[PDB]
Amino acid sequence: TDRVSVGNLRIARVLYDFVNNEALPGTDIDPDSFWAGVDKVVADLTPQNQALLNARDELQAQIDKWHRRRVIEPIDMDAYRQFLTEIGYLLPEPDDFTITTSGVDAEITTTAGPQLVVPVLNARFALNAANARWGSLYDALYGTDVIPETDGAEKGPTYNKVRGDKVIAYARKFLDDSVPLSSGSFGDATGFTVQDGQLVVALPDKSTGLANPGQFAGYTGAAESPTSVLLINHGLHIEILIDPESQVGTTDRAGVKDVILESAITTIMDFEDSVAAVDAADKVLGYRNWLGLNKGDLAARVLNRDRNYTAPGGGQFTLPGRSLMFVRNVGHLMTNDAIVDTDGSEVFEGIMDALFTGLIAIHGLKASDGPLINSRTGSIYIVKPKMHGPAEVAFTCELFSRVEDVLGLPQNTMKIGIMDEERRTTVNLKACIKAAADRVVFINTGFLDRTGDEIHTSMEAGPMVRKGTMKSQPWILAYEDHNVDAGLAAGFSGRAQVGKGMWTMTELMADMVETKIAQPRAGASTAWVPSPTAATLHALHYHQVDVAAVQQGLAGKRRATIEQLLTIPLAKELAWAPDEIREEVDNNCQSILGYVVRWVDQGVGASKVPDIHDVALMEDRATLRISSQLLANWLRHGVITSADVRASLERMAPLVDRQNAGDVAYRPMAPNFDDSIAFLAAQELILSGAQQPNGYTEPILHRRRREFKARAAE
Ligand SMILES: O=C(O)c1cc(-c2ccc(Cl)s2)on1
């Protein structure tokens, strides 16, 4: 074949060449000893990796049997919880502690703000995310529905002045609320001056300074009529751009051209649920973009330089122009044929990701060719998804230690962002944080994956409530609060991020601005957004809410009990009219088909996907886990029949077809269903759902995408 032998490993040539030619030079790692390290790490850690995956299985089987041997009305929580304890699912909670993680950048320890997640296989997206640290508020307001397209203020082929004026008024209001003047409002401002280290704002009748002079952070141009004024509020920068000669500036009372907000403070470059990578060629493409980002030479459009300002006093300084990058590795489950052993057995992809994304990240710790791209404090930031419990966390930390040795990095260089998205992590969260107490830089919650796990875990208990209902169930509200509580009690405030989930409705920005404010109000120092535009709008929330104060107020509170966490989301007796059952089935089948068809046919793992009511959603692969699990649960307990499932898939497929009309490379699923690899993938996810380990959709998706790629190669 086309593989390179390195001890017991057989490495795909594309990967071997990529690493030797592009990734290794400049790192001062001996190529030969790097590869020997790969072979030794893979050999040493593979059995523990497999042991952990079998443990998930054995635990799940015991819970399955517990439910099946019982026939009682409601679950006896006391009994249930004692059972989870005996079998090792629920572990004892350790004593209080404070995390000791060190060498972490300010963006993570201190600054509260939006966090972008983007598919690393899409160079354009990744570049846009990296540059999304600063974004135009005017663009974000004019371009979306945050300013209503009421009569007269609608978006046309060209500039609407009525609408522009609403934009301007909106941002004036933001400035008054965020950086208030001593007297009067920015709405009446006439000009900006810097007089002896102090900001002077001219009003029609008088002039005034800031109510808090310290929020003045700097300017550009001459103090006597600056080209911009830089402000700071809750650690986030705001920049007023001054230019009376611009399209918008000409019509403005102070000649203001735009307001620029520091938005995406950090970004997660994603190798997991937002991308489709099923072989060596797909992995190399992702690795190559990750390398381009870290070397700062990725182009598809390039990376921004830092921003230059004059201090208020008159000196000079500089602010980062790029979002600080994390990478999200895949989790413990999947293998990938980018490397096989002599037996033909695929190597664990999570193990490979640590080695290769870790190797590659070394470049971000040094000079691009300009200044060094990423971490100035010398850290590598890796998000590790889908872990179940503190043993799996300890394993990931040991994998990182071993990689650090192979790479010649100081111990604890590789920091860990722990996703709390699996039930066995949730109920043992404190122990999970403790297992990573010297590497952890965040914890984070989310709707989709965690709900998918909830469904699979109690699959045998009975029929679950509908998908839309899940978002307001006691278990999940408790899960959200417990996560914040565990983080703050572990000393995250001032040290590590406490993060919340993605806003998926990309076009519903008015709704996001209205509702997402709940997350920083709950003490989240960060939350996920789908686009640079959403990052700029969500940044508004951090100007309104003092997250640090919120966190300080929550300290010491125990707002969720183990009993609440363990409250299974079972439907009541006879909860749904027949029409309601049908809507939910259609809803879920459309969700699966819509996402699956792009994934299997085009290898796209994230995009704006129209839902059943044509609302544009940007969800990752976890949308598949939840939908397939709910349908599998409804089929399992006799809520619906296999003909209902079939009929819905067939009803939804043409709909998904016409929803993809704009796409030149799209191939329809209807009417030849059993010919469409994608349609068959969607069906398999449902009918085999209950048998997939923890409801994970990767084994099936990966197989079907590989099958599609093979067909197309003929
Ligand atoms: O719903 C989620 O959890 C989620 C959505 C995404 C996205 C990846 C790329 C985008 Cl662009 S949005 O990542 N996680």
Ligand SMILES: [Mg+2]
């Ligand atoms: Mg997830």
